[PDB]
Amino acid sequence: ATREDKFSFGLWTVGWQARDAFGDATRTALDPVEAVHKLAEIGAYGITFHDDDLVPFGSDAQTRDGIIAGFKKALDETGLIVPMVTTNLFTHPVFKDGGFTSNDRSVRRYAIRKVLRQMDLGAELGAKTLVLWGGREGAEYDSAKDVSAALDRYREALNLLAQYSEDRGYGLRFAIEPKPNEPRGDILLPTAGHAIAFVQELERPELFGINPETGHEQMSNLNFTQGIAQALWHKKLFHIDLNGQHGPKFDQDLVFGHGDLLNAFSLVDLLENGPDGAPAYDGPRHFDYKPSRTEDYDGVWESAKANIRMYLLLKERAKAFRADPEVQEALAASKVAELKTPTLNPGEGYAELLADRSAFEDYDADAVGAKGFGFVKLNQLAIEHLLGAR
Amino acid sequence: ATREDKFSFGLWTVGWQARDAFGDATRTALDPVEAVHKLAEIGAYGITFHDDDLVPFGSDAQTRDGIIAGFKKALDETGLIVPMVTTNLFTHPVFKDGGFTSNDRSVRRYAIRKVLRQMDLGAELGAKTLVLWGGREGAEYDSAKDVSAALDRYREALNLLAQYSEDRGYGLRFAIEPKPNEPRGDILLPTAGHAIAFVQELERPELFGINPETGHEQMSNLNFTQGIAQALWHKKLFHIDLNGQHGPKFDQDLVFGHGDLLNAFSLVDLLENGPDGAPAYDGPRHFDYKPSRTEDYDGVWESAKANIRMYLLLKERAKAFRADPEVQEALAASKVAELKTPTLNPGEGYAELLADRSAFEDYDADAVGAKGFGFVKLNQLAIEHLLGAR
Amino acid sequence: ATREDKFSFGLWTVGWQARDAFGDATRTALDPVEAVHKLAEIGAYGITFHDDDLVPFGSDAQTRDGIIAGFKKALDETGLIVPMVTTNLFTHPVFKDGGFTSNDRSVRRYAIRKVLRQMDLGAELGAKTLVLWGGREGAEYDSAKDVSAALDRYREALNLLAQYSEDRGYGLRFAIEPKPNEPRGDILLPTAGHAIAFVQELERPELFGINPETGHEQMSNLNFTQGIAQALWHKKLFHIDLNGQHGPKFDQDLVFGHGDLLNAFSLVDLLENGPDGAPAYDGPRHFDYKPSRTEDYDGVWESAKANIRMYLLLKERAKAFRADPEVQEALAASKVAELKTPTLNPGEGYAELLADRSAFEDYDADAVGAKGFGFVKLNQLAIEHLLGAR
Amino acid sequence: ATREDKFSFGLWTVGWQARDAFGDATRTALDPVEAVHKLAEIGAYGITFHDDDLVPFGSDAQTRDGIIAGFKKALDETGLIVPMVTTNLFTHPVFKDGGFTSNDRSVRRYAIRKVLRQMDLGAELGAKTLVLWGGREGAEYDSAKDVSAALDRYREALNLLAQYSEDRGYGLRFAIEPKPNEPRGDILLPTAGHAIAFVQELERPELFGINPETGHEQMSNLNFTQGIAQALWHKKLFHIDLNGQHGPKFDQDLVFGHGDLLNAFSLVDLLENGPDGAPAYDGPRHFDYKPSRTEDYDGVWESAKANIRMYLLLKERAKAFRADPEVQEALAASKVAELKTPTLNPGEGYAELLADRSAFEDYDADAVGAKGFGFVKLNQLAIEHLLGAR
């Protein structure tokens, strides 16, 4: 693990005290400064936090100020950077119906102020990305929330934030994080797709992208790799949260690759074996996971390293997969690269196509319909590389 | 049922022979002229079809020609219109890896030709919408499909169709139909969101929208009404396919309202209790369902009528819900309408918001967080309206 | 709502303060005597609780005794009974790996002790059923739990509890409550089926049954009504927890009928329209739900009453359904009752079946296969009864 | 793969012509004798079949007789055996509402005769297991099927079959195969648990067990390895069907290990690293899968071989896993084996347990509650073994 690997961890990840919906915390609170030292140590290049993770909701400026100074010291000494910050718009009871989209007008005004403030701190620490997780934006009942009005209000708030950042010269990028449910019955912008469509409607869309999370897409049983590929095609992959999940159930937040292992592999392959050797993605490889409730601080550090471990083992196998002449031969036989050739010849339009008898009148669909694509075999070669059997 | 209600059915719904993945057909073939006659009789205002549902794959021109004239005569006599047409790019073995996105370049070329042909016929019959269902676009294995190249090719093909329509003066609108899976392990553009985001990237986006299907969103456990609300917000709801489903499992295609009843109710409320007093959506209410395999032709006509009956029954209760004073009161208590009031006062920006001590510095979040929204009570009044209990 | 309806509620239901996985409690603590009062007022005939709901974990004998006496007075004054009691084996950190099947043997012994104590209290308050919810029984990782050993230890603990109850003459019945996941990644005895199979291997199986909960089976997308019909077939429906859920996602605990309305309808029909006119189930109709986090104490009593109103409105429609002559006619056409007639004639065995040419050699499968069952029409009539449209 | 590996395939697997719910077959039919030869050649020890796979539905006795004789010769010459047989009670239209549980009495009678006839052929080919897949036993609508009457009729048919077998001295064991849905909306006996609980109610339970299939339990998002563990505890694992699936969606029938890889790994560990060095299960390792629709006959044989490769690679990794002193040390730290030690001391009863102050009075819940189990670390070593990183 090198700083060039860009592994980052949220302070709320290793810091999770393990108080779930059904029981009390099983671990004590982790000191930010300590987190900073431990992460530095296991090989992370950066740390992220929610305003309320570092400074307890409601601290006076004196306390608030003190905490920041100490945190700043720790980054200093260790060389860790803060690539991204986020705001907590979900924990306090006032946000029970959302921040930006709460039906109560006062709550919406307050939620914007809370974020502007976090934007200030972010800028001060050199953060380039503001992640927005609208965990409480949504509903349990259909008649309780006007989605249209809600989207108008989500948009109004975001447009203000971009206005401010651009005026203060912060140069932040905004990353909307999709989640289908939990804690609300249904959350607005439920998938990477919905989040991308929404961003295209903002005032300065170029400043906005998405921060998709492994488990979030898997909670709806979607293919995370395929969703990232789409995000990459759109050029809206501004950040990414890696973790593990076992399908449609509560959000598990397991270590990266401890859930759908086969998808974890295709994912590393997509991010790393980009066009011309180079990665297809350049930002932080952020782990937004939780050390299982059954573990102690020993278990905590273990799990932090397991994340890095899993990513580096998969990368290694994805590289070997692509480099294998037999895979290279199977890729050819399956015509994977033929999808890159335009369907139409150069300068060809409808008329030329309509005049080409070979594309219709004289085409033998039955004969082409019978040739196999060799996909099972290519798939089997991939898994054998994953398994270290090749 | 009135023509003003705009209920339409696909030829392939009532005409489905009930040959499933595990058994033979239990019903004989339905004659198209017959279908037009029976549908006219139950109150449908229009009929739709895939090319291959009307004219059997590979019919010579004489044959094809003959079928169309008979069909147009039936239309004529009954007063039924053809609001939308679509193309079968999924049945024939040549389409096993997709039509527009098949790895094989020749299939992609053939796929476009098959659609242009269907476009002409739709144009000829007065159809206004071309529905595109990319059922074979996707994969079973991640290494088999280059998603980026696939999107490029899906885009390449649609740009061409719009070019053609526009040059010819056809005036067609194009509606992409999302589905998460089945027949492919994962289909490209899996949710309403992914499809909207994609469309925003074509050459003439104003010409493209979506055709979301109740059951397809429910196969991922998404809130159908909430995704339609988002589609309407983007102004991309070009068509809608109504049916029923029981969560994530194979596509059931039940009668509209026979799966998630509460969501069927909230959907009808959304489409009908629109902006003025007026519907929020003005297109065809299309039923894309299948009469259960256990039914004979009496069952088929019963199921067609059930679709219209479910809609009209829900419409009537949605209307009553909104007209109830007790509901008005509950809506007031839950602050539904307050979401429609901008968060900011007219002419207020971040400078004015930052200057407002009451939006943050003097804001009593604890007090606000203690008041209830009364959402359960609102939901209970809605359900009682649904049950005719009020 | 009469006391004969036998609506009961857990203290933890209306007492949920709404501290979820992602946020703080939105409501203050509810006083138990008050709860007894409030529930008696809305129509409940009994109240239930976990040891720890009534007496704070780590209460001195004096305090504990103090609480109980006040609680009994309240029941006294109100006329409410305690039909069932349960034990909390999921909250305290020591149970992080389970109670009865913790890998740690000291935890198992402690868990048993904790239950015996509740049995005593239960026996003393007149409870008839001990519900066992193994929420911490399971694992996040396959190699961490020997399922066979865990089943042995689960059995070993239950055998003892039955032994004790029988010897102290408590007359308790034990109801195992299945849940597929949450809080453990995977819980042991995930469905009503697994729980029944397990019970059958105990020493005095006649003393054990299950307590299935609507939401738990729906978390796996199973048909709750159908599972309950299987439970009744086996005679293992010792208790039932009613609530609502929107498929595979976190456990929602909505008001009964606020999730899958169609299945809530069919369930009420099955429990009430039992053979010989009479209900097929005579135990408590217990609501194990949670007033939404967006609600205050008024929303809380509103939600309690909604559970009762939903059950009674559905009951009324299930009876009207069964009483409708047209329904009677559709049931006959669907041959619902013909399934009750044995396949074999009295005294026929394989020898006589083999001799019947009409059951095989001369059977016309094709003519039988062509006749429809009229199921769609029958379903349509059920729904129309549910909507009060008939 | 040796014959000792006992890998078997259904004739219907490699012989699936790939006609799905949305398209035509992509492959021509496979001759059963050719399938026998090909299978033997890749290392299979046995072949299985549904009556209708070998002998076309409605074949005259001369035709049927010829097929069987040719079949037997191939078996002879290759040395392959027939370990299990099954009956098709799902394809023909007559079975649209089920076989044994159809509402129509005559269908129930014919279903039993179809099965008796297959039992004869089975017994003559030396099969020891009869698998029962009730694919059509269920409903799309709740009111269409009396479940209780259905279970009565199911049991009635099964008792007769056991009777006939016992009387003819066939010595067959019966394995019910659970499936949650598809082709019916909901299938009776939906999970391995439901089928086990049902079997326990038959006249001769000892002759009955289950045939669970990987994808089927994953269709409900259940832990397959954990449910197999429970089946082994009950001693009802009479047979097993191995394949791949991606959570809740249509039945994919991918090659074993191509779905949930991590669960495939823990499944192979459970079966082979049984108690006493030896496998915990000794029946056939049957592959009930389908070669993807995109493949030709080369892809079909490649996929048959992929199943066996998949199983042997995971077996090798499972073995190394367990022989690793670091893994053993982690197991000890996680206390996995301590679950195998009774909770109660020998001769200890409730009286003695009540007497141990160390189990309650003097129990430090708080101190125990703070020790970590090291489960993450153990999971990490398990995956490093699978990855061949160790």
From Swiss-Prot, chains A, B, C, D:
Its main location: cytoplasm. Its cofactor is Mg(2+). Mg(2+) 1 binds at residues 177, 213, 241, 288. One of its GO terms (cellular component) is cytoplasm. It comes from the Bacteria. Keywords: Carbohydrate metabolism, Cytoplasm, Isomerase, Magnesium, Metal-binding, Xylose metabolism. It is an enzyme of class 5 (isomerase). InterPro entries: Xyl_isomerase-like_sf, Xyl_isomerase-like_TIM-brl, XylA_actinobac, Xylose_isomerase. Its EC number is 5.3.1.5. It catalyses: alpha-D-xylose = alpha-D-xylulofuranose. Binds 2 magnesium ions per subunit. Mg(2+) 2 binds at residues 213, 216, 251, 253. One of its GO terms (biological process) is D-xylose metabolic process. Gene3D superfamilies: Divalent-metal-dependent TIM barrel enzymes. Belongs to the xylose isomerase family. Homotetramer. This is Xylose isomerase. It comes from Actinoplanes missouriensis (strain ATCC 14538 / DSM 43046 / CBS 188.64 / JCM 3121 / NBRC 102363 / NCIMB 12654 / NRRL B-3342 / UNCC 431).
